[PDB]
Design a protein around this nucleic acid. Sequence first.
DNA 1: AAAAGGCCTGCAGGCAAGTGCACAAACAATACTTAAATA
DNA 2: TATTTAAGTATTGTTTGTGCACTTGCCTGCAGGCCTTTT
Lengths: 266, 105, 191
Amino acid sequence: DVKKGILLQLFGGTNKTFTKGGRYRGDINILLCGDPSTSKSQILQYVHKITPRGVYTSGKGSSAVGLTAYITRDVDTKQLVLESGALVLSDGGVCCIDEFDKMSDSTRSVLHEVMEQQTISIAKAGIITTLNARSSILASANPIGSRYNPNLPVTENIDLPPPLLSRFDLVYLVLDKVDEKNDRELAKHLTNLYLEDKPEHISQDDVLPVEFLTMYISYAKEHIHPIITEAAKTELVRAYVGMRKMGDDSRSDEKRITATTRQLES
Amino acid sequence: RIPTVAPTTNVGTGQSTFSIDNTIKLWLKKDVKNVWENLVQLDFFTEKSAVGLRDNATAAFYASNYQFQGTMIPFDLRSYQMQIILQELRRIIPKSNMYYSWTQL
Amino acid sequence: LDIPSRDDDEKLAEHVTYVHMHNKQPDLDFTPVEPSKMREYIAYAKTKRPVMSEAVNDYVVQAYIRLRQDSKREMDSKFSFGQATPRTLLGIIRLSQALAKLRLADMVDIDDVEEALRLVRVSKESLYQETNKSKEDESPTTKIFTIIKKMLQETGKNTLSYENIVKTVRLRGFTMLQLSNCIQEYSYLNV
DNA sequence: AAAAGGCCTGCAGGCAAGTGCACAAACAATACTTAAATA
DNA sequence: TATTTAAGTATTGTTTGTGCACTTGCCTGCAGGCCTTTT
Ligand SMILES: Nc1ncnc2c1ncn2[C@@H]1O[C@H](COP(=O)(O)OP(=O)(O)OP(O)(O)=S)[C@@H](O)[C@H]1O
């Protein structure tokens, strides 16, 4: 299912451009969290390698300037230069961010803007401006401590404040199990790749187009524009309503994640 | 949330155009106590911790000899706990009622 | 955790002072290698890249499973190393591969990965007591009893006619006089 | 000389040590009631 | 047929019980404050 959400991120949305309003964040954004050592970071590497525009980036080894380019009034010709937007390099195509929790509170605030408007409004001594950086962030995470506490509420087990959290279009909980049923399957799924010297197709031997799929994506995102038929509208509305009424409670206020309009946007 | 129009002028020497604005008879402290007793005896409420009915007449009699102190605390401080919680309350009051939008917080 | 013992503070101290006497910790039976040519051989080994052997996998796999399950029933327990991860499995495999490098051989041995397991477990239980016990050595009649218990797992009867029991005893090699003695004891023991 | 990236320290993030103690029930024998023995 | 009150009844009064609490250290979690550069 993680893979599924990732794929859906790759094809992200369509640019519905209104003459009134506008800037409806044509793409999506996927946090994912779970027990340490559960492939998250490696999935991120894998995606960043897949896309033709990815910009890997770590957390807590980066600052707000690194996340969103920084402007400079060049005194040479007295002009506006922009520099090194990690987010701006990813204009179009995905980004990746690790240790998203370990990110500083001084940082992790530019997100509060770029993720929902895809713009960065900088206003410092010399210059005020708004540089638009359309980009589908894709962040890893780590629940507080070093694993769950299934005696702890979930939206407290994740640390991020509810605004920024609902900002995220889709949150995954990759929990590690003590199955012993998949465990030996996973162990074989590693030992096999260790069997060969140059291991390929580590999983079941079903043909899959490692290279073809990229051109497939870069065709799909550019030759087809889905128009939401009428019937979809109904089942979408009812789905949202059911999502939210379920979330309704008196004590859901402090501990739960509430279904909000961004659920419908998602 | 009511438009609360209270104009003052009118036709010359009209004395009309009254200024009614509250338009909900907020009941006083002196009267509500009636409704409060009605409720507490309709069992929607209860005392903080009250043993309803003892096991037998022995423990019941031994608890009636107890000179209680909640007697001493006045009417408007007995900490009553609830019998029907707000969530359920939202599920039953027909939405036609003009207070329905307060069942939910 | 340095348990303050006596033979340690004896031997260690003696041998440090002996270093002061003879600047070589190597005693009568020892082959110390100078770090230069040591490094040489080490790098040479590093230039090998051995291969994982196909047989050991299952064993390896099984090891992981074991190292998994106990961990759960040891989460809140004393040795609170919590929920050994697939990274532990991968680290075991890597340790085995490096030991095979030390073999300078391209196929990992079952003894190789077994040594790796010994390393990973000696890291454990090194906290306290560091001891175990054994009780099942004697078994001159208790073994008969356990055989009977397997038979009971099959059917579960306290019959008064023993013909498969005596057959399995004779197959086990235990005599019939000791068997009859034990039967006496357990009938008196009311089973 | 000051304004903008970055990194260091004062406020307190917090909670088990822990005692007070305000809840409860029989409590030990109150205070009094009611049948009997004697003139 | 009635004064003896002796036993008995109904009731008081109180005993420790705890059920809950709310206190006062604790280092770390956090965040306003110091360093740097450019004009
Ligand atoms: N189901 C799995 N499929 C593939 N690799 C796995 C799986 N489970 C564990 N691994 C491996 O275990 C290691 C875990 O790496 P990651 O999970 O990406 O790192 P990480 O989980 O981000 O670590 P943290 O603590 O979450 S930051 C990698 O070597 C993975 O290849």
